[model samples]
Target: KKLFLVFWWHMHQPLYREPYTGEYLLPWTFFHAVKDYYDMPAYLKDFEIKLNFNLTPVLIDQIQEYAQGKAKDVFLEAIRKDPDDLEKEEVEKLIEFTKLNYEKPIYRFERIRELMNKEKLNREELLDLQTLNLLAWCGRTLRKDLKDLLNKGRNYTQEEKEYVLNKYFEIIKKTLSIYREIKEEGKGSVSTSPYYHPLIPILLNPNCVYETTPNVKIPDFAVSFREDASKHVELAKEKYFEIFGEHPVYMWPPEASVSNEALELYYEKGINMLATDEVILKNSVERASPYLRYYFRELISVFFRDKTLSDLIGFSYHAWNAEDAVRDFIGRLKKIHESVDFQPVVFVVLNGENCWEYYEENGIPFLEKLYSTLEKEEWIETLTLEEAMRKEDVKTEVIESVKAGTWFDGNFLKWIGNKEKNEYWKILIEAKKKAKNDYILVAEGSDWFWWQGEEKAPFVEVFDKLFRSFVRRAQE
Candidate 1:
């Protein structure tokens, strides 16, 4: 049986927040990921056709937000509406109110301004960043919903709806521009996580987009009762319909954290298959199912990623040659395929699209070549999760439930292991059980946001605000 390899470029970014205010700064992380990875030779280098990529909603909104020119409108509007325009005597008060600072923060706002003065930031870039940030705040505040609330409860003097509609159209235009460019040059398929990165709660909270929370801290007693997270499979799956005009048979769970409960959600959402790490197989008590698919507690038909080889592409191989890496990767795949006796065995899961920035040279040219090589191989064929599942017999058996876990650090620690990570996880547990309302388990991701150094990054406040927001919403 030939090995079926499913590749996914899991691209994500921390919700980049404006320093002074707790609102997100648009497009900084999103644009960077697209420019550096997505819209580059790395992804398109393999010309064989369809590839899979995972784009978190947070990143998607930012991309569309910037394209819409919201940043330019907001930034310029902020300048025009400069709250300090009251009177000479009230200028100081307004300045303090807006929290304008002459001194730069650590390395952001002022640097960008400096770059602007030095002509380092082009007009388009300035517009993109400005619009990106503005849209981010809009997303955070639920601008559309906010407008609805204001229209219903509050009275506005002029035609705000016109402005809003105009802005919406502009955003649509920009998004369409990006879509056209990508659609015109279709090298791969794009999919999004349920909501955004760290999607533990997004899938669990059906109204995740509307639900606002400031923290992830679940109550102490509830920690023991926390269940497998999955509530928005339908909504998440709906994204495929909204964007791509079809139901995605396969869904990439945010951060690659999948369990039987999550799989059930996928099935409920009409997804026929999903991709996860190979550790699931290692941790599985049953070796191979009778039908050639990997069986777990309550879920059937599993595709395991060769984590070591995937890691080599994601974490290792910067210093190694592309040819050597591909050889090793294929060799590992072959070995795994030989070990398993299946007609259409799919060795699924691959990443490093956005995370490539952390790697040297962005691992672009090398990755492109690697994918191209795979496309040409006869014994090994790249297939989407749906394609592989179709080739295998669909079977199900109920077994013991698998516990809460992730692709990284198996037992759910890479994101929640350290003091900060544990603290966040604890919060999620409490909120999950005690939080009066069902809210998106926002920000439980064990990414570098919480762990920049042994000591902690300067942006802990941002993380704090994110956590607190969730908690506040949970209480409300």
Candidate 2:
């Protein structure tokens, strides 16, 4: 009997565009693209590994625009300026942006650390700092020349600064192309999320929240936009098809959120498979196995992420030595194999881009060791989500219905529960009802709410202003 491992990485960034200004309030997408996006797929080519990558459609759109030199964020604008021309306020903003990835990239470079520690930087020092920060984010493996420059750790000239900035667009183009080429080779399958990455179940019906947390407070107005739900799926399919040359068969519902109503919408859209957090499976049935493919009311195949395994990679393993981490991960898998009688498809999924910054050497050593160890193991077989679904001996369990929830705590509270989150939702409901166009529909994305309450994001005010701006435009 073999243990089938399905590793799915969900890659996403919110629709960061401020609709009214045509500028991205946040520079995360560009920062993440330089650091994580390109190398993630490109690195996997070294081993015979099969995995699933869920690239949100909105993220792809933004990547294309940036690659074509059409997109600009505040950070990008700041970088393009001559340091001598920068105002005092502009210098302050640049310094703040330079500190954004401090732990991972800034601290890693000696000159960057020196400049960052300064009370005030001269024009030349500021230019060197900006250039080094950009170089620090470039993937170590994909851009060896950049890495060599980073390794030199010194005073960079204006020519060197321009080289690093211009190189970003070139790498962005290559990153999108690499995903397509690797996907065409059948080493991996690329999937899509809802176009704007909205919380599908809640968007379909706000009343669905009571199904999970029946005692939770209810919104004053009943929210229902089944049409917008369908539109999200259709738009995702269209954009994915345009980029990858085919429609995706799999759906990673925004935040792995699902409900029976959401399933019906996916079924209608012809999605063959969907994935959610394992907790949802546990809550839906008396005894749920993370190893088996679950049928959501028998409409489509469903897979649940193994939280313990996924989190180890996402959060824990960075602290351990590369070999030790691989051993511990495989040890867990071997234990699972011994504990279960059935051949199980263990799904390990997590955020593709964000996790690497926390990792040592951007998780290259750990991943390489993990993949190599798995290759040598006879019992463990790595399979893409498409390949796992095709296994003949696999058992399918029929879930009568799925509970409404997300990857966090098996409920929708993260996006809609808190006072601040709920307040944002109220504004969204008002705008959604009045809007004649789909711009407000994009505002319905979970990323806005993600920045709201206790887990408030760094730029929460920016997100709040953007969300309210969309609502204001819709009302106008």
Candidate 3:
């Protein structure tokens, strides 16, 4: 029997908007826009492979706004300013923020490296640094003309900088349109997360955390918004229809976070399939079979991501040479195929945008080699989650209950178990009591918790403030 490879790429960006000012506090949505959103699908087109992309609705809305020149971020505004006119503090902020792509893209530019090495840079050098940094974030294949300027290296004119910035918006405008074309061509199937990407389990019932971790401390207040959770799902479907002119049949709960109630909510909304971390399946059943789809109440088919394989591409593959990585990946798959008697369906999933920056040439070489190898491997066939679900040979097992938690540790600790996270929940609970508007619901997204605790993100402070701002505005 053939090995059915189901690949799901979860594409998401935090709800970066500030409820008070109507401004996006962070520039990541725009950065990832030029870097990943368009190039990812475009890269997969050449290969005869079918994959699934879970596009979060908030990200879709923001991309459309940025495409139409309706949204602005601090970094984009800073890029448009003349270096001579930029204040010293402003230049410092630009340097700090532009360094977000530091590990891979930023260092590739000699002009940027030179300025970074210096104690201070002149106006011209600063402008060149900003231009180069922005250019670096763009995918290698998406903007060819900008790469020409990038190849020129050092000195850049004011007009040239404006040209690159304008080109970025042009690329952004094409991002969603590209996805639409991919869907129309049957190249890939598009799925979606909830409207604002909130941790649906906690939204359904905060006390559900006890299902997996009974020892964990409960929040001060009992937080439950079943209707709002359903609203997030319904709204996502509506937005997906408005943007893509089609409905998505698959749902990837934020952070692969799911519970029995959340699945019921998704089932009620007509999402036929859902995916989460493999650990959840292992916890749910005595002998979890990643090869077969699991049915929750027989209402929806559930697929669990193969964490090891997914992380190899997301985290580990970059360290090895392109040829070696592809070879190693296929070797593992071959072993799995041989080990299992029946046709095994392996769900390899990961974040589409975050992982590329760590790889060489923004992961172009690795992807090309991997896709080419898959094409030659007659034993392995790439299929979208939808396609695999419909296959007659693929068997299904009924899972009476799903362990309550997320991809991390098969528990909700990443989002709400700790003191810092619990406190944030308190704030959200207070806000929910005052107002249950879109801002409050969006504020409850898992991203706020992601920025909390020991392993905080670079924009943790901004995320913290934005969360509070959403709560404060809801009161008004």
Candidate 4:
């Protein structure tokens, strides 16, 4: 088609729940990721679209387990069926907590309108109270709702809960199955982050915790969950094989933490490719050596993302118009093609299939426009990695050994620069060497919890749990 490698986008958002209540709230992150992004009508077209999307297992649970209406079965059963008195009591406590936490605000907000109508307070005063109370009570109540729903594990029909959980797992499996089918068609590729979403592993240990921001503080027991890496890896692998019918060809390092050691681990696992920032290839003297051309080093092939082009579409174009976006995209590709001396191969790496949230209209029309434009262009072409390798005679000459780095923070500071984050990473690194497992769960902890600028947490405690949980999972 002479398509100018108009590599499209990839989007991902992890499953997030309220920490205390485990409720999937109104603006559920995964729901937003799907509804706001994936439903775009443009995807229906037969363009040479490519994707390496990561739909985290946790999110899969939410979709088929909770969001799909089977959660009602799980919730009611958990609240209704308990053999032990103490367990029942605790369930009652949770149920009451859930009711108090969830139901009140929904019902009360409606009551508030009635009370205001009855002249219990002036309109202005009523409005103020409603706003304040709604914010406080409604949010808490929603968390309770999710908790109650999840807690319905005991109340389900004999096999209802199991069925739903199984269904949830199958949903993930089916999604992956479809992705593999599409991949087989040579129009898509399935890729995922190592962690669920918020790749926060680098910020947990004593050594690398400092790599995270100053505002991210760790909890006192932050180190408690430092051994569960095996559980995480096993689950992900189980799901991957279930869906794709094979081990993953590539591990898109969450936030691109593709250090040499990390690369070696994937190589050992029979992964043929790994993605990282272009800086990783450029800065890695040993990994970049000419002698490495088309040769296996540590048994891995590398796809270095051109971060500049990706940033323009994923981040910079939020406020930009459609035409300008297309123009800029074409210009960027044109520049790359020129720079490469019209080389038959080039990779303008975009994200998998999860980044459409930022686009004005789910990025469908924009994507179609972009591809249509490129399809007509003559100077460049789009090809899958396998296709590119087959057609191009280019080879890596250098085996440049890269320093520790990630896509998010080029200097390796996002997870290791901050004092607390540096510690988290150090613990993980030491644990990785000490552990007996073949694979370790790399937790990319939540990104929202690390902002000192938000001034919300005294320190990044939320991320501390994230790191510890991942470590605990690694141990199992």
- Per-model RMSD to reference: 11.7, 1.8, 1.7, 10.8
- When summed lDDT is taken over every stretch of 10 residues in candidate 1, the lowest stretch is 98-107
Give candidate 4 regions above 4 Å deviation.
1-11, 17-22, 40-44, 49-52, 66-181, 195-234, 286-298, 342-344, 350-358, 389-392, 419-454, 457-476
| C-alpha local distance difference test of each model | 0.48, 0.82, 0.83, 0.46
* Span of ten consecutive residues with least summed lDDT in model 2: 98-107
> What is residue 138's positional error in candidate 3, in angstroms?
1.6
lDDT of 3 at 179: 85
Q: What's the best-to-worst order under TM-score?
A: 3, 2, 1, 4
Relative to the true structure, candidate 3 reaches a TM of: 0.96
Query: For residue 38, what is the lDDT in candidate 2?
Result: 84
lDDT of 4 by residue, 91-125 (tens): 44333333333332223334334433553334333
Question: Which lDDT tens digits does candidate 2 get at residues 1-476?
Answer: 88999888888988678877789888888988887888788767777878678899889988987888878687677776888877777687777766766777224777877887888788779888778767767775545657666766778777887888777777888888988887888888889998989999987888888877887774675556788899999999999999888888998898889998999999999999988998888788888788888887778999898999998999898788889999899999999989888898899989988877677777778877888888889998888778877787776788878788888888988887678888888887777778877777778888888888765435668888888877787666
Q: Model 3 off-target regions past 4 Å? A: 143-145, 455-458
Error of 3 at 105 (Å): 5.3
Q: Could you estimate the TM-score for every candidate?
A: 0.62, 0.96, 0.96, 0.61
lDDT of 1: 0.48
lDDT of 1 by residue, 1-476 (tens): 57666666665565454323535522244335333333432344326644566656555555555554443322234322323233443333322322322231111233334433543334333333333223222321133344563323222212443344345444434442443344346644566666535545233542221212223332233343223344344455565466666655666776666655566666655665555766554554455332235544434555556577667766677657767877887787777667766544544356544334433334545756677777787877665445556654333343454434457655444443356655655666666666665343344443432452245434445456655565557656
Model 2 reaches what TM-score against the true structure?
0.96
Residue 213 error for model 2, in Å? 2.4
Worst 10 residues of 4 by lDDT: 132-141
